[PDB]
Each structure stands twice: as C-alpha cells, then as structure tokens.
Design a protein around this ligand. Structure first.
Ligand SMILES: [Mg+2]
Ligand SMILES: [Mg+2]
Ligand SMILES: [Mg+2]
Ligand SMILES: [Mg+2]
Ligand SMILES: [Mg+2]
Ligand SMILES: [Mg+2]
Ligand SMILES: [Mg+2]
Ligand SMILES: [Mg+2]
Ligand SMILES: [Mg+2]
Ligand SMILES: [Mg+2]
Ligand SMILES: [Zn+2]
Lengths: 166, 287, 132, 108, 152, 148, 275
RNA sequence: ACUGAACUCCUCACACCCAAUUGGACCAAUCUAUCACCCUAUAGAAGAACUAAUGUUAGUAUAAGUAACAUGAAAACAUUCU
C-alpha cells in the first residue's frame, strides 16, 4: 500500500523572507478503507472540487449518497486539524484544491448463480483524499469570448510558414 | 485639474490611514463576544484597531460573511471593514433581519455615494460639477437622492434617457469592479484639508464636527472617490445587484446656484426583485 | 535544529515532551544574547533524585514559524528579557544535571501576543437546550 | 447479447463523466435565520425539526403515562403545561399534560 | 398514459392502498401529527380532510358513523373524531391539515413529510415565515402602495 | 521515428563560420581504469594517441582520470554547454580514435532530426512572393466591376 | 527474488537518472565540478579563439571586483577587471561605430548608436559570452553569472586582447563575434523606434524633400476580418517604398519602416557583410 | 509534351527485403574458474530469453455501477393497526 498523503502534512518549508508573498496553508487529509465504491465516491469528490469549505459542507449535507456523509466527516476533520495544527486563522477560509477517491483493499466473496455456477463478488472499499488550501476558492475559468477566440485564430494564421522550401 | 485633485485627496487619505495605523502599533488582544442570536457565547480575540467585524465573520463562517452587512458593536452600527477599537459585544445585521432599518439606511447611503462617484466622473471635462450632499431620505421615499450643483453652462440642460442609462451603466461598472468601502474616523482638521476645494463639503464637515462632541468625521472611499458619510456604509459595491439612476429633478428654490437632485433606486443581491416589480419601483423612483 | 538526540541527554524525560511536542512541524529560530544579571542558585532538595532551582534573568530572541515558513510568534530581531526559574534534576549514578521543569510564577507578566486572531466557541447547545 | 469488444477507458470516461451523470450543484440551500442552521428552501430545518420531534416525543410519553393503556384516547382537548404554568380560563376542561422542563422559547 | 389519473398506485393494489391510507389516517387521528413518505401523506391528506367533514356531519349521522367506523381502525378514536376534531374545526370550512416536507428519511432517503391536524396541543412545527415587512424590498413596495393609494 | 522524436532546425552555435571557425568541443574527460579488460583499448589510446590528438586540438582541454565510475567513458563538453557522454567500453584503439575525432568535429547541438538540410536567414533577395507580385495594377486602383 | 546483480544495478542507474531529471541539482559553476584546471582552461580559451592573449592580462580580465570582495570576506573568516573592461567597452563601441559607419554611411548617428548599443547590450554579449565559455572562466561571487557581470567580463577579455595583440586583431575579433550577431536581424528589430512615419518625415526634411504622400496601392478583402492593404509612400508621384498590413494604418506605418530602411541603406537585400 | 517505381543514373555507403529447411556472425541474463575487485573481461556450464497453446496461477479491467437483491404501517419504540 501507499501512505504518501499522510506524509504530505509533515513537510516543513523554509521560513519565508519578509519581502515574500504569504504562502497559503495546505492541509492534506484522508479516510482509508471506506465501504463504498470508488466509482460512486468519484462523483462526490468531483462535485466538491474547487469549492470553499463551507460551500462543500453545505452541498454534502443535502446529498442523498452514502459517501456524502463520509466526505463531510473527512472535511470537518480536515478543517479542525487545519485550525489546530496548520495555523489556519479562519475556519471558513479554506477551499478544496484536490478531492479524489482511490481504490481500497477489497475482499472477494462468492455469488451463487443458478446452475451450480457462480461469480466472484468484490466487497469494494475506497479511499478518499482531500487537500484544503487556505484562501478564497480560485475563480472559475471564464468562458472564452469570441474576441479572444478569434485572436487565437488570427495568431494561428500568422504562425503559418512556407513549408518544405528554402 | 480634477485628476490632480483626486490624486492629492487620495494621497492625503493614505497619509491619514498610515498615521492612524502607526498611532496604533503592535497587537493588543481585544475580546469581542458574539452576542447574536445564533452561535451565542463565542469569543474572538482580535488585533486592536486592525481586525474588523468582517474578520469576526470570517471566523464564524462564510454564510455570516456573505449575509452580514453591518455590525452592532456595543449597540452601535459599525461598518464591516471599520477596525475594531476595544473589547465589545458584536452582532451582525443582514438585509433580512426582523428590523433591518439600520442595514437599509446603510445600503441607502452607500448607493447614494456610488451615485456621487458616477456623477462626478460622468460629465465632460469642460463642465464643472460640485457634489453638495447626499440628503438622508427614508427608504419609503422610494429613491435615494444625491444633490449636485452643475455648471451654469449646463443649468439649462436636463439629462436625456440615454444619459441616465449611461449613468446606470457606469454604476453597474462600479458594481462589477466590486470595490470595498474604506472608512476613516478623521478629525475635522484633516477632513477639511482633504476637502479644502469643495466649499459644500467643507461646511458639511463643519456641521458634522459641531454635531459630534469632538471633531471626528466619517470619511468614506470607494476608489479614488472620498466623501463625508452621514453614517455607516455597506462593505462592498457588489452588494448592489439592481441599480438605476432614474431621474434628475432640479430643486425649485435655486436663486444662488441650481441644485440638481439625482434620484435613483437599488436593490441588493439578497433582495432581488422580479422584472415587473423592478419596473414599477423604477417608475415610482422618478419623483 | 531539532537535535533530539542531544536534547534527550540535555533535558529530562519529564521535560522532553514539553520541549519538543508543540514545536514539531514548525521551525524555531531561538537565539541567545548576553545575560543581564549573573545566574545564581535559589534552593536545592532531594531512588534518590537531585534537584536544583536556578534563577536566570537573561535576554533572548524568538521567531516561531509555521510548516510553511510564515512567522507566527515573536520578532526574530528584537530581543526580549526573560525571567526564568529553571529546576534541574539529576540521577543518583551516571546521569547529569538536566532541565526538569520551569516554574512560572503567577505574578509573571503575560507572554508575547500572537500575530493571528483566534475564535473561542461558546457552549455548544443541544436541541433541547437554550442559551443563558 | 454479449459485448463484441472491451470498451476503452476513454469511451468509458466520456460516458461516466458526462454532465448528465455528474451530481448537480444544489442552489436552494440557505441558512435558517432562526438558529442559523443550513436548510433547503422548501424543506424544514433539520435541527429545528429535531428539537420539535424530541419535545413531541417527551409530551407523548407523558400522554401515554396519563392514558395508561391502549384504546384510551380522551374525548376532550389536551393542553401542555410546563413548570411555573397554570391552566388558563380556556384551558379549563382539557386534560393537562405536565412537563418537568421550562417552557421552550419556540413553544408558545 | 395516465392523463387525469388522480390516485397514486400504492401498496399491493387498490384494497392495499386503501388500507395503507387508512392506517396513516388512524395514526393521524390518534397523534395529530405523523411522519410518512411524502407521496403517502399527499394521498392521505384528502382523506383526512374528508374525515373532518364527516365528523362535522355529526355523531348521529349513520353514514358519517359508518365512514368513521371503516376509516378508523382503532374505535376509541371515533368519539375523538366526533367530539374533539370536528368541534375544533366547526368554524373552518377546510384546510384542516398542515403538510410540510421534512428532511429525507435516513434509512432509504425517501422524500418525507409531516402532516398534522391544525390546532393540536403539540409543539408548533418550524413553519416557513415570509420576509419581514421592514426589509428594503418590502419597504419600497409599501412606498408604492401608499403612493398608489394617495394618487388613486 | 520522426513523430516520436524531437526535431530542430539546421543551425550553428554562434554563426561559427562567418568570421572565423571556432571548434565547439572544449573539454574531453577520459575516465579509464588501470585494471580491467573493458578499458584496455582506452589505455592503449591514452598511451599512443591522446597526446597527438591533444596537440592537434589545442583548444580542447583533455583530462585523463585513471579512475572511472561504472564504465570507462569519454565526456565531451561543448562551448554551447552540451555534454555528450560516450562509453568507451571494450572499444579498440581505432574505434576510440574515430569516436574522439567525431566528438571533436561535431558541434554541441543535439543529434536529432533536422527539419531542413539548409538554413538561410535571408531566403529572399528579390522579395518573397506575395499574391500581388505578378499582378498588374489598374488605373486609379479600381477593383473589378467598380463603377467609378 | 531472482539471483543476480546486474539487472538490479541497471534499475538503480535508471532510477538515479530519472531522479536527476525530476529534481536536478542546483546549478554549480564548472570550476567546482571534477576535471577542472584553470590554467589549462584559460590557455585553451585563447587557442580556441585563435588569439595570442597574454596570460596575465586574461587572468586579470576574468576576475571581477565582486569576486575579490567575496574572497576577502571569506579570508577574514588581485587586480580586478574594471580597467580592462572599461578599455574594452570603449574600444568596442568606437570600433563598432567605425564598422557600422563604413558599412552604412547613410545611417544616422542615432541609428548607429542604437545598433552599437544593441550589439554591446546585456542580452547579445551575454549570449556570446555564454557560448564562448567566458562564464566558465569568470570568477564571480554568485552563480549563474549575472548578465551584467558576464558582459563586463567579456569586454574585459576584449580589452586584454587589445593590450595583447593590438587594434587590428581586436577589430577582427569584434567583427567575428559581435558584428555577426546582426546577421538575419532587421534594422528595427535591433533599433526600436516609434512613429516611423514621423521619423521618415524628419529625414526627408533633412534632405529638403516634401512630406511623402501615403497612397493605397493594392487592397484585398477590405470588408473582411483578414484584409490586406498595400500602402505606398510617394515623393513627387514617385514610389519610394510600399508596405503591407492588416489595416491601412499598419500598412502605412510599415511602409514608412520600409522607406526608412531604404534611405538608410539597411535593406534586406543589401550587400552582405564582408569577412 | 509532361507526369510516372524500390528500374537506371547521380553524392555517399553497402552482408543489411522469400515459406519449410539449411550455413554462419553475434548475443541478454544466470552460475563456476580466474580476473575485475565499479557493476567488467577471458573461458567452462546451463531449468539460458515468450505479442500467441479456449496455456497454469495471481492481479485488475470490460460488460457495469449494469442484471439482480431487500424492510407491511404509525407510534410513546410500551403498543396498536392492516
Ligand atoms: Mg445447487
Ligand atoms: Mg410498489
Ligand atoms: Mg521519379
Ligand atoms: Mg537497384
Ligand atoms: Mg526455458
Ligand atoms: Mg510475460
Ligand atoms: Mg497466454
Ligand atoms: Mg464498475
Ligand atoms: Mg446495458
Ligand atoms: Mg432491475
Ligand atoms: Zn433552524
């Protein structure tokens, strides 16, 4: 197995010079061996990617999927440790930079089929990972406008060369 | 030149800001207790004259930050970005409280100030504009008013519908810019130094310094635009969602100079009004 | 430098968790500068464990950062005067005199203020409870 | 019918990451001005409803103790009274359910 | 095609649907407040209103008595229906029940509702309250109202 | 393949031939083992050919280490900063000689696909063709079907 | 486990290569790396450039004042290259001015000055020094050598060449290693100008010629999003230069640029530099 | 007329385009001798090389989050009702 996510909280950066932008805090948290399909968990993770901590908690509190409660618990734990151990000033000043689901260690069980035949069930388990970055959530990428998009087209036109010649 | 006037006023504004910040150095932990109905009993230890009710809201949650428009620090309305001074009790006021009258007044003043900025930076250079005052009118009045004296070259000119729509477009540009409402409790001396040119603002500053016990005056700035505030204002200009400069009525008793009252109407994001209701409000905001 | 190998011999086991626990995952730039008054012993008492109380009034500098290298306690340049009552303990055959505990008197002045603000939740209320 | 070819991860991603399959962001979530709890606009506040359910359960336990047996539904109105409360004039001729706690602020 | 079909298909059939609604209605008459899946509450609300009307019809009315006898599986509730609920709503003409949506059932995430008979002794539900008349929008509308009243 | 490999354009380092030719190879470092059949050829090269090469290429500094790491090698460093490391494992004296001469004659530019066999900074003397070369003009610049 | 060592060692070597690629070590000056002999390197520098530098002068040219200061600071716990760099910069500027004024007699003094500034600027000289190995032999206090220090050292080297072999050889050196840096370059790619139309008007006034008439010679796709406009400048109904562009203003500006190139004799098809 | 091949010419280089089969030059890794003592060399050996046997074992995919499966109702969780 791999347990690199846990180690990511223990990296100490060198002290910053006074004339240096304040490095945003980063909190890595995980729950391992959740009795839930990683494929089902992925939808919740994707849902809350890039959202503020409060917005993510609000969205998860009203979601019917089982994984929503687990993700909410993980997010609340991440917030608590961000305040206690990672010197985050405001609880709400956190956004989900990364949230993914990973395969867990699964168990194989037998499903009995109808003619003395069978299948192999997998008691599926998943991991859930979050990185919480301090600061307001980064603005959503603006849709590209006709002006910019035509600018790109004209740049492509100008890039043209006379190919296969002197 | 008007650009030079704005530049020097901003320079004085920043000078006073730095002066007060230096006057309050280091960090003195002041205890501010949330006396609000929700989350009661919480305490924030805060940096004296540095932290703000906005910072307290940030500690509470993002919902408080987005929904809170004013603060009753010790029963008095404080701007969300006005540095806290002493340990106190704090309660956050939103637009949907049972009695939001204070929040309504603050929104009304802030909308008037935005109108003032738009007016001062609308007309062509040759014409001269003098922002006399933002009369304090009840919300029931249906339109926030800002009083301005235009040039004699324009005393015979009334804005067209397209001019009014350009004013609204400038106001919406300001809203989109989303500039915070900076505050300063500034003594009448520095206030007068900043507004030396504007006779109207000078005498208004004198009036305010008379009314209050000391000579402390409320200066407010959105961006590059500084004005005397009748009271606390909104945190940011993005609180406004629907905004319209509706009319310009020339006050009837104008012998010395012609005072034009720019009337407009606004509603915040929290209290958006349907299109038809908004049209009716616009109609009634032209009186 | 988080020299825990030397710190184990330098401080008692009763003191080491205090010395090294809360400081984990954060850089400290503690430094010493000339003392203000000479250190002198205060009192001593006593299978058998030695115990010496020494009074020091020195001058020190602190700068505690985060995992991310952003200051969170004390200026690194401006020194502060520190009054400490340090209690050493010794093992009585090969043990030495190691820091055992620092006695903070109730009348000691408050420590340095912290840069960041803090929220302190009030009593959480159950559904059937009401705030009073 | 059986699949004729294994479906590639690229096709599978195009399918299972489609917006139709993605969870939609809910925009009817807000804060209950009473207690500041999160709620959906059309749904009751979960915390407030839990308060009411617990109080209702206690009142109903008192009612059950008073009735003492199945099929003992009273033919008269009921009134809940808390500590330091007295039956009013209109509370006359109504069975009194006595609660040992004080009157909740939200209960009127 | 189910154009104009007003009755949900519940339970194991028509009789089972009637029995399910009957049990829900008996619970409602007994407790004056019931949690159940939203659709079942919605189906049973009309029957609850009709029972209140039948109770208004009077204790001595044979048809009302037979309807109550069928619809209340616990017979101690029939005196309650004819002597508590019906007198309670004698003044009203309708809207005897209050139905509100409740957070989804934790078990199966079902859409849940609470239905109560208005005027019960139980603690009031957290009803939804409209915005205060003192809000900015409401004050502007009050200004419109006053101006319209004065002008016309 | 070309599509699975980087490509560049024909070029010199600093216009290497315009004013004068500057040999781009500047350093050779031969790590050779005293003992070991792998470096026997390298030893013979150091004995019999390295001195003549050095005096033939005065601009190339040649180091001989006599203490290699993991294989006997020759590291060629060019003026443009490129470093080309070539194993001289089990190579004969003549093989090492040819390899070293190739390194000497070669430039530091990457040995990847060269898009064009030629490179002109001034491809045109009479003016690059544009649609209006060879097109006659008309009186008053009137476009076709123009009224005036 | 499979018996054997060679596959495991090969895998370790591959892992080490990948590690160096992913987290390459911080750059280190060549002096601190193995296989370095300063005396041999500097003699090779001279022989590479085919010039008989005097070793003392070249050594002094490669040492910077900042290096001396750092060395003294370290010694607490040498002649710098300042005068040589000053001599080299002065001579290089004067001799580049000579080359350029001989090649382009019509080029105005401003154009010649800008060309010389381009050829002796930080970017060009930094590039030349880097690819001539000046950086490797440079003694500075910080690495990588900043472009200003690198330029100073390069001109110190030029001054050392001057003192060693003379103005003629130094002029050949400048011709070979700085005059070549303008090959393939465009006049206004080297000399940045604003308002080429105004500058052309000024030049024509100096020549006592009337202001040129801008006139649309050829056009295509006028109303589309990709127009082509050819604008020609006419002096007494005589075409002096025409230029293409997307808008009429751009075409006119670039036609002015073409006219300036033709007047200054710095045209694309001009006689190549003679070496 | 031009176009038109791996034909032919041209610059350079050449052992470097058949099945079964056959001849030959090399050679990965392993072990042994002796070296090297760094990661190799000369030899002697041999369970000495896998894009293919509905190959064996193990892992994980696809089909697929699909087919399928499950808890009568309310409630004071005492109880009552269907
Ligand atoms: Mg069987
Ligand atoms: Mg069914
Ligand atoms: Mg052919
Ligand atoms: Mg052939
Ligand atoms: Mg085998
Ligand atoms: Mg295999
Ligand atoms: Mg196989
Ligand atoms: Mg699946
Ligand atoms: Mg299917
Ligand atoms: Mg099915
Ligand atoms: Zn609530």
């Amino acid at each position: 197995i791999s347990r690199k996510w846990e180690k990511k909280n223990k990296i100490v950066y060198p002290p910053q010079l006074p004339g240096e932008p304040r490095r945003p805090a980063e909190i890595y948290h995980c729950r391992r061996q959740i009795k839930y399909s990683k494929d089902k968990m992925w939808y919740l993770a994707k849902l809350i990617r890039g959202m503020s901590i409060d917005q993510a908690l609000a969205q998860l509190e009203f979601n019917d999927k089982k994984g929503a409660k687990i993700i909410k618990e993980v997010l609340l734990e991440a917030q608590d440790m961000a305040v206690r151990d990672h010197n985050v000033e405001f609880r709400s000043n956190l956004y989900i930079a990364e949230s993914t689901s990973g395969r867990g260690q699964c168990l194989k069980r037998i499903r009995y089929h109808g003619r003395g035949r069978f299948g192999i069930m997998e008691k599926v388990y998943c991991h859930y990972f979050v990185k919480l970055v301090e600061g307001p959530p980064p603005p959503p990428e603006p849709p590209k406008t006709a002006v910019a998009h035509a600018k790109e087209y004209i740049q492509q036109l100008r890039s043209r060369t006379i190919v296969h010649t002197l | 030149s008007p650009t030079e006037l704005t530049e020097m006023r901003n320079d004085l504004f920043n000078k006073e800001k730095a002066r007060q910040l230096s006057l309050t150095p280091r960090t003195e932990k002041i205890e501010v207790k949330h006396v609000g109905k929700t989350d009661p009993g919480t305490v924030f230890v805060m940096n004296k004259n540095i932290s703000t009710p906005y910072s307290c809201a940030m500690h509470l949650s993002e919902w408080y930050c987005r929904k809170s428009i004013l603060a009753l620090v010790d029963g008095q309305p404080w701007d969300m970005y006005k540095p806290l001074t002493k340990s106190c009790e704090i309660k956050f006021l939103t637009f949907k409280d049972c009695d939001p009258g204070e929040v309504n007044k603050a929104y009304w003043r802030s909308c008037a100030m935005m109108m003032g900025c738009v007016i001062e930076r609308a007309f062509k250079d040759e014409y001269m504009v003098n922002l006399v005052r933002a009369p304090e009118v009840p919300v029931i009045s249906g339109a926030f008013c800002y009083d301005v004296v235009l040039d004699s070259k324009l005393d015979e000119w009334m804005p067209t519908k397209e001019n009014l729509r350009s004013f609204t477009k400038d106001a919406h540009a300001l809203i989109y810019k989303d500039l915070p409402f900076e505050t300063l409790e500034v003594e009448a001396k520095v206030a007068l130094e900043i507004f030396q040119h504007s006779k109207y603002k000078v005498d208004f500053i004198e009036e305010k310094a008379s009314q209050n016990p000391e000579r402390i005056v409320k200066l407010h700035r959105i961006g590059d635009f500084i004005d005397v505030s009748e009271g606390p204002l909104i945190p940011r200009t993005s609180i406004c969602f629907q905004y319209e400069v509706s009319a310009v009525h020339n006050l009837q008793p104008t012998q010395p100079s012609l005072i034009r009252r720019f009337q407009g109407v606004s509603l915040p994001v929290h209290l958006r009004a349907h299109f038809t209701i908004w049209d009716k409000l616009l109609e009634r905001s032209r009186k | 430098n988080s020299d825990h190998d030397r710190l184990h011999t330098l401080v008692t086991e009763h003191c080491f968790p205090d010395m090294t626990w809360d400081i984990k995952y954060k850089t400290v730039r503690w430094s010493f500068v000339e003392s203000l008054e000479p250190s002198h012993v205060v009192q001593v008492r006593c299978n058998v464990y030695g115990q010496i109380t020494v009074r020091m009034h020195t001058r020190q500098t602190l700068a505690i950062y985060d995992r991310f290298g952003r200051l969170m306690y004390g200026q690194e340049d401006v020194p502060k005067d520190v009054l400490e009552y340090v209690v050493f303990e010794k093992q009585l055959p090969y043990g030495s005199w190691r820091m055992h505990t620092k006695i903070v008197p109730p009348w000691a002045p408050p420590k340095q203020p912290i840069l960041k603000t803090v929220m302190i939740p009030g009593p959480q209320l159950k559904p059937e409870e009401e705030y009073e | 019918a059986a699949p004729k070819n294994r479906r590639t991860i690229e096709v599978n991603r195009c399918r299972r990451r489609n917006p139709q399959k993605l969870i939609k962001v809910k925009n009817n979530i807000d804060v209950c001005p009473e207690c500041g709890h999160l709620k959906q606009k059309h749904v009751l506040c979960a915390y407030c409803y839990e308060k009411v359910c617990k109080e209702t359960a206690e009142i109903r336990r008192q009612i059950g103790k008073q009735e003492g047996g199945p099929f003992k539904a009273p033919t008269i109105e009921t009134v809940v009274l808390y500590t330091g409360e007295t039956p009013s004039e209109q509370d006359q001729g109504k069975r009194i359910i006595e609660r040992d706690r004080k009157r909740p602020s939200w209960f009127t | 095609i189910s154009h104009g079909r007003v009755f949900r298909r519940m339970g194991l059939g028509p009789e089972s649907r009637i029995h399910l609604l009957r049990n829900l209605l008996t619970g409602l008459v007994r407790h004056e407040r019931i949690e159940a899946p939203w659709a079942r509450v919605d189906e049973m609300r009309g029957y609850a209103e009709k029972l209140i009307d039948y109770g208004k019809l009077g204790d001595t009315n044979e048809r009302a008595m037979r309807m109550a006898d069928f619809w209340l599986t616990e017979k101690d509730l029939i005196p309650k229906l004819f002597q508590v609920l019906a007198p309670r709503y004698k003044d009203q003409t309708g809207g005897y029940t209050r139905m509100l949506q409740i957070p989804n059932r934790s078990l199966d995430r079902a859409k849940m509702a609470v239905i109560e008979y208005k005027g019960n002794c139980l603690p009031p539900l957290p009803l939804p309250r409209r915005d205060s008349h003192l809000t900015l929008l409401n004050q502007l509308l009050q200004g419109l109202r006053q101006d319209l009243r004065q002008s016309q | 393949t070309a599509r699975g490999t980087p490509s560049r354009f024909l070029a010199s380092v600093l216009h290497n031939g315009l004013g004068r030719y500057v040999q781009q190879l500047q350093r050779l470092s031969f790590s050779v083992s005293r003992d070991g059949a792998s470096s026997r050829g390298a030893r013979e090269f150091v004995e019999r050919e390295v001195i003549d090469f050095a005096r033939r290429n005065p601009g190339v500094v040649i180091y001989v280490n006599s203490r290699p790491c993991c294989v006997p090698r020759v590291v060629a460093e060019y003026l443009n900063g490129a470093v080309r490391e070539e194993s001289i494992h089990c190579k004969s004296v003549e093989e090492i000689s040819t390899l070293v001469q190739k390194l000497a004659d070669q430039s530091g530019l990457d040995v990847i696909r060269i898009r064009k066999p030629f490179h002109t900074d001034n491809p045109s003397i009479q003016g690059q063709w544009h649609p209006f070369t060879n097109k006659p003009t008309t009186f008053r610049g009137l476009r076709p079907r123009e009224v005036q | 486990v499979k018996k054997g060592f060679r596959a495991a060692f090969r895998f370790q070597k591959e892992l080490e290569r990948q590690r160096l690629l992913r987290c390459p070590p911080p750059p280190v000056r060549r002096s601190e790396k193995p296989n370095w002999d300063y005396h041999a390197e500097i003699q090779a520098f001279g022989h590479r450039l085919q010039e008989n530098f005097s070793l003392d002068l070249l050594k002094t040219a490669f040492v910077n004042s900042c290096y001396i200061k750092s060395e003294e600071a370290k010694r607490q716990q040498l002649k710098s290259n300042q005068e040589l760099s000053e001599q080299g910069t002065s001579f290089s500027q004067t001799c580049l001015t000579q080359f350029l004024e001989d090649e382009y007699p019509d080029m105005p003094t401003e154009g010649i000055k800008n060309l010389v500034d381009f050829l002796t600027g930080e970017e060009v000289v930094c590039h030349v020094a880097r690819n001539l190995a000046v950086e490797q032999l440079t003694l500075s206090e910080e690495f990588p050598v900043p472009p200003a220090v690198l330029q100073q050292t390069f001109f110190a080297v030029i001054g050392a060449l001057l003192q060693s072999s003379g103005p003629e050889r130094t002029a050949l050196f400048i011709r070979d290693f700085l005059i070549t840096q303008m090959t393939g370059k465009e006049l206004f790619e080297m000399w940045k100008i604003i308002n080429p139309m105004g500058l052309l008007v000024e030049e024509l006034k100096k020549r006592n010629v009337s202001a040129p008439e801008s006139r649309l010679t050829r056009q295509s796709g006028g109303t589309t999003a990709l127009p082509l406009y050819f604008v020609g400048l006419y002096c007494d109904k005589k075409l002096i230069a025409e230029g293409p562009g997307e808008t009429v203003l751009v075409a006119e500006e670039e036609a002015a640029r073409v006219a300036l190139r033709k007047l200054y004799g710095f045209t694309e098809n001009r006689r190549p530099w003679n070496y």
